[PDB]
Amino acid sequence: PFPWNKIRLPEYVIPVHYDLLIHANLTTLTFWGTTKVEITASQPTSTIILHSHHLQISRATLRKGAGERLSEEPLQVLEHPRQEQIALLAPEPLLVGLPYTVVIHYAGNLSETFHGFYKSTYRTKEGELRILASTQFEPTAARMAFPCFDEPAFKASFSIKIRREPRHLAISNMPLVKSVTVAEGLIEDHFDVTVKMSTYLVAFIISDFESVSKITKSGVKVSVYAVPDKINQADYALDAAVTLLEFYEDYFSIPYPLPKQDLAAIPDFQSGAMENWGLTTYRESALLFDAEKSSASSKLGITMTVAHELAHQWFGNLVTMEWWNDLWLNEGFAKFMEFVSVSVTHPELKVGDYFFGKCFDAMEVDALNSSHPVSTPVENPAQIREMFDDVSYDKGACILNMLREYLSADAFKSGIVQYLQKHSYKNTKNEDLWDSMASIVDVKTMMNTWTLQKGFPLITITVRGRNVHMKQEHYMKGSAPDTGYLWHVPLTFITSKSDMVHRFLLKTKTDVLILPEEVEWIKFNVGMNGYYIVHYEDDGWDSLTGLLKGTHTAVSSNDRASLINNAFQLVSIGKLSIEKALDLSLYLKHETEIMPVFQGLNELIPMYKLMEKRDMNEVETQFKAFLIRLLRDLIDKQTWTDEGSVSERMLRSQLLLLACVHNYQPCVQRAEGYFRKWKESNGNLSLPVDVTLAVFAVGAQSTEGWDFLYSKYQFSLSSTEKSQIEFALCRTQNKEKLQWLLDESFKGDKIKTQEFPQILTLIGRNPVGYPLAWQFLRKNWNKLVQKFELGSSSIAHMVMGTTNQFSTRTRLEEVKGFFSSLKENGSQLRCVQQTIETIEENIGWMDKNFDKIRVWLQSEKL
């Protein structure tokens, strides 16, 4: 009879301090623990509820302190596995306010997943298997490594002890202060006590990692750890980490409080990285940089990833959301701070130019009924994991950028600094942030509209002479009335007569402003800094289209990208015809800049991905031919080198890949020649990294080229090269080779299971592989859920990646029928609702627009 029937823990027993002893065995793959937790109770209780999941509790005792008067008593242990709780029943009720210590002895098995205290493996360059043990606790997995009050507002200090063999190294959040030999071949490592922090930030790793280190100007020792064969790839991240940690310290004037910061590259890792305080962890591909083989986008990504994890030391670690319903206070800030910090530390990366793309990523999910408000209730672990999504990260960062532009950077920064100082070593809610911002204008009412309602507004612009009428309505996909949503929208605009950014706060359904003089055109949402889209009535879109085709330089590159995106979003709600949007996209014939070119691809590629899964080869082929002809001049100018800026290199790589994939013969023939030479070199030839995706993708189209690529994958130490080979192998039209890739990465021996979600999605996007990938997901669902967990973005990626390009009623019924059959093991996943809604929109969109597109292509206006 379990004496607690709620997922959330009681509020009236609070921990202060944990002493954790962990004894792991990497041979038998087991671990033993002794957890001591100092607690106080605010209410007389005889029962202590806490979290424990897959731990075998052998004994629990309660201690009542005092030098000579110290007494100890046994606790009866009950378990409620589905609530992931245990109950410790004491003989006598606890006395309110006095300190007790709970002592729990337990055992467990190292996890075979990517969470908890889990096993990771790698092979020596000689083929020898090595095993390490590492942790991943966020959000709710600390309870798989030690019993605890495993909710983020039960903060406490942690003294961690690790018993290990002499031959292995242990590292944890804090510096190692003492090592003591405790038996033959067993050493006990003592790490210093942590600051007050949440359970999900506890970390420890037992490994044979090597390290490199460098000291910040503030005296913090920063180290990168990696397997011996890869530690010579750690230099870039080490330098970036020192520069970025110094930036944050100087920026906020709030020092990093720990003596050291480690960055550990783990051979198996589910997410990109994790911000454990003092011991941040990473996929190898998110941290390790090979100067000969890594891509420009991987160098950018490492820099932004380190910036993200270091931002968390303030936004997440020092200040933590009170509950996962406000996870965006961690993840939206960390995402935003990537851009604040790297725009200063690495100005050559020009990252601010890319930021608005994150907003358009958010709008993809946020246009669907199945989105959710930025702040929204969650309770169970699957729902909590679902909060780690593009709404929390990208919408979160986007509405922060919008607010910063509205308040100004200096006022915004003053608010953030006060927020961090006031709530240091404590927890915050949505409302605490607005209070801090306002203490420096009704920020709270405004920002409640952006955090407590899902979605975003369509702003409609109607001009009569100097009179500029504005209307807001809720953007709802499928096509005009909605649930009366209303926002406080900080509008911006420029005109043909003024490129000063003008500002107007729209707080009502309708309003108007008066221009000083009549203008030839007006353009709202300058730089795409606002989380809204714009429609222009009357001649507006015709006129902005002529602007793009005549002097597309009248507005900025990101303003051009914003017009491309908005035009195609308006097609899906019936405010603009597909033909008018495609007419606008023809201006891309003369576009040179990466953001508008990439935005054009982001709107047009999905159209032929839908066609690929239908009996539509003729229109599909014509559409792809249109796309190549549209960009042919830019493609033809690309050099087959690694020259130029990061932006020039990323643009080059994607254009050459696109051209080769669509059989543009000039590019195919060059890629074939490079691939033949690479093979004849036995893989010893150094290809330009920027052409390697295209070269490998073409080479993999034959059996001998595919087999040769796979043969080289075995021995590569380069995360970029391994990603490029994986991408190429998934492009084959040989269905038995596609099945092999699914089987082998599912197995995890020749290709690590951490790559499986990506491989499944790439085959799902393959014009001949998509039936195989969808079949594989259905057949292997239970094991995939066991490995990756319900609610994980891994599972969401697999679900969307195998289904969200379907566009027929029969495919829709397959999707609805399968996921409905899962009951409590998947039927209620939010990603399932999102993919179903996406298929429903795809059906309507194709039914309405396919013949329109066919006729438009026949008009050969290009």
Binding site: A273, S295, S297, T305, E331, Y393, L693, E726
Partner: peptide
């Protein structure tokens, strides 16, 4: 973390 696909360049 979420955004880890940039190696695939």
């Amino acid at each position: 973390x979420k955004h880890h696909a940039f190696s695939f360049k």
